[PDB]
Design an enzyme around this catalytic site. Structure first.
Site, PDB file in Angstrom:
ATOM      1  N   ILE A  29       0.871  -1.221  -0.144  1.00 52.41           N
ATOM      2  CA  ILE A  29       0.121  -0.378   0.199  1.00 52.41           C
ATOM      3  C   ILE A  29       0.326   1.174   0.223  1.00 52.41           C
ATOM      4  O   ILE A  29       1.967   1.801   0.614  1.00 52.41           O
ATOM      5  CB  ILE A  29      -1.211  -0.413   0.990  1.00 52.41           C
ATOM      6  CG1 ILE A  29      -1.947   0.995   0.924  1.00 52.41           C
ATOM      7  CG2 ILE A  29      -0.318  -0.278   2.807  1.00 52.41           C
ATOM      8  CD1 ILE A  29      -3.621   0.897   1.497  1.00 52.41           C
ATOM      9  N   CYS A  30       0.073   2.326  -0.739  1.00 56.50           N
ATOM     10  CA  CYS A  30       0.832   3.503  -0.590  1.00 56.50           C
ATOM     11  C   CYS A  30       2.173   3.961  -1.705  1.00 56.50           C
ATOM     12  O   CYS A  30       2.346   3.459  -2.817  1.00 56.50           O
ATOM     13  CB  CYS A  30       0.864   4.430   0.744  1.00 56.50           C
ATOM     14  SG  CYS A  30       0.698   6.136   0.754  1.00 56.50           S
ATOM     15  N   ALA A  31       3.417   3.958  -0.408  1.00 56.68           N
ATOM     16  CA  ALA A  31       4.627   3.678  -1.156  1.00 56.68           C
ATOM     17  C   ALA A  31       5.201   2.755  -1.298  1.00 56.68           C
ATOM     18  O   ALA A  31       6.004   2.820  -1.943  1.00 56.68           O
ATOM     19  CB  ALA A  31       5.261   5.030  -0.304  1.00 56.68           C
ATOM     20  N   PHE A  66       0.588   5.472  -4.345  1.00 56.88           N
ATOM     21  CA  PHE A  66      -0.130   6.745  -3.862  1.00 56.88           C
ATOM     22  C   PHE A  66      -0.116   7.313  -4.853  1.00 56.88           C
ATOM     23  O   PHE A  66       0.526   7.749  -6.059  1.00 56.88           O
ATOM     24  CB  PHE A  66       0.651   7.318  -2.855  1.00 56.88           C
ATOM     25  CG  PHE A  66       0.089   7.994  -1.975  1.00 56.88           C
ATOM     26  CD1 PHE A  66      -0.975   8.366  -1.376  1.00 56.88           C
ATOM     27  CD2 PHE A  66       1.243   9.516  -2.436  1.00 56.88           C
ATOM     28  CE1 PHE A  66      -1.632  10.026  -0.517  1.00 56.88           C
ATOM     29  CE2 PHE A  66       0.986  11.060  -1.188  1.00 56.88           C
ATOM     30  CZ  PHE A  66      -1.242  10.892  -1.108  1.00 56.88           C
ATOM     31  N   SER A 118      -2.227  -0.829  -2.940  1.00 59.83           N
ATOM     32  CA  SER A 118      -3.415   0.137  -2.489  1.00 59.83           C
ATOM     33  C   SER A 118      -3.320   1.669  -1.868  1.00 59.83           C
ATOM     34  O   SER A 118      -1.559   1.331  -2.241  1.00 59.83           O
ATOM     35  CB  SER A 118      -4.234  -0.656  -1.420  1.00 59.83           C
ATOM     36  OG  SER A 118      -5.262   0.421  -1.215  1.00 59.83           O
TER      37      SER A 118
END
Ligand SMILES: [Cl-]
Ligand SMILES: [Cl-]
Ligand SMILES: [Mg+2]
Ligand SMILES: [Mg+2]
Lengths: 195, 195
Positions: free
Chosen positions: B104-106, B126, B154
């Site tokens: 997720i994200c980075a 992200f 995600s």
């Protein structure tokens, strides 16, 4: 800089506590976490087993000048809060000194109602604990801000973003709340403070 | 019986990590948290200062029986993951052995892309790091599940519920995902696994 006191007890709801802390820090609010109902032990085992280290025992920070006191939910954590005379007195003192009380999920019904802290305030909390809140006081709403008594309440793990954003709005303003909301990739349905 | 290995590093995004852990436990999934700190320290300071205890150092649990490996974001946490040869080897081993990688994200752009672990497949992350995902792989969706390579990705703190629910779907199924979702008071913009 604005500041917040976030209380933690054995059995606190970790998503509620951590999401709130994270958002407040993103909003530029200085956050202190306090261990409640643990005789000073800073290691807190939350409701689904996440282990957090609090900054300080409540008794050492309860008299600080924080702008808001935050009560996460989690049924056992909220029971610990309810049964801590220091926690209850501290909540009352925040209110009487013109500061904000913020509570989520089980905390409104378990802490605020039995101690009659806000006898005619409007509040929400976890929906299937609706009947633990006086019918004349209950609203079924993701977040309730009762500006008259400076009481912020919210419903559950999934409303923790909405809860944290409203704290930011109240302590550091709408523009900062929107800035933070814009960092999160929030779900449709959650208010982002652009308007 | 399903199980998840959730990795943690200095600078991990605490909302992402903790929301995911909480939801997996609600889903009946056994969770082990693994520190990727280079010295083996388990007391992790996350990206906004939350102090989270990991269960074990990665070296002790990497060979355990886990259906999914989870990589939270937080740029410095993701950099730690990228720069850990054990973390990278472990992710590759989960993939090559037919298990799931969830990031997720980075974490997608910082860990997966530079190490070329998924040269073919769709992924998100992200949005400000979109230009660090190869254009033919990028999708702008809250969750991306590419079953061809068993890669779940995600976008950010605000998609952590979507992410955790999809892990539940993949390990335990839609009925359990809907059960957990129904507990949360989550926003209307998050898929709730009911049809
Ligand atoms: Cl104390
Ligand atoms: Cl989407
Ligand atoms: Mg306003
Ligand atoms: Mg059944």
């Amino acid at each position: 800089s604005a500041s917040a006191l976030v209380c933690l007890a054995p059995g606190s709801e970790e998503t509620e506590a951590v999401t709130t802390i994270d958002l407040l820090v993103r909003g530029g609010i200085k956050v202190t976490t306090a261990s409640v109902a643990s005789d000073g032990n800073l290691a807190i085992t939350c409701s689904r087993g996440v282990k957090l280290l609090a900054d300080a025992p409540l008794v050492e920070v309860a008299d600080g000048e924080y702008d808001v006191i935050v009560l996460p939910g989690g049924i056992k954590g909220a029971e610990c809060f309810r049964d801590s005379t220091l926690l209850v007195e501290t909540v009352k003192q925040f209110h009487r000194s013109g500061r904000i009380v913020a509570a989520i999920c089980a905390a409104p019904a378990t802490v605020l109602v039995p101690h009659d802290i806000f006898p005619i305030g409007n509040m929400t909390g976890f929906p299937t604990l609706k009947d633990k809140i006086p019918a004349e006081q209950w609203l079924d709403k993701r977040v309730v801000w009762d500006a008259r008594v400076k009481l912020l309440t919210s419903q559950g793990p999934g409303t923790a973003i909405d809860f944290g954003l409203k704290i930011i709005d109240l302590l550091v303003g709408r523009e900062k709340a929107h800035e933070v909301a814009s960092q999160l990739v929030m779900a449709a349905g959650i208010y982002n403070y652009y308007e």
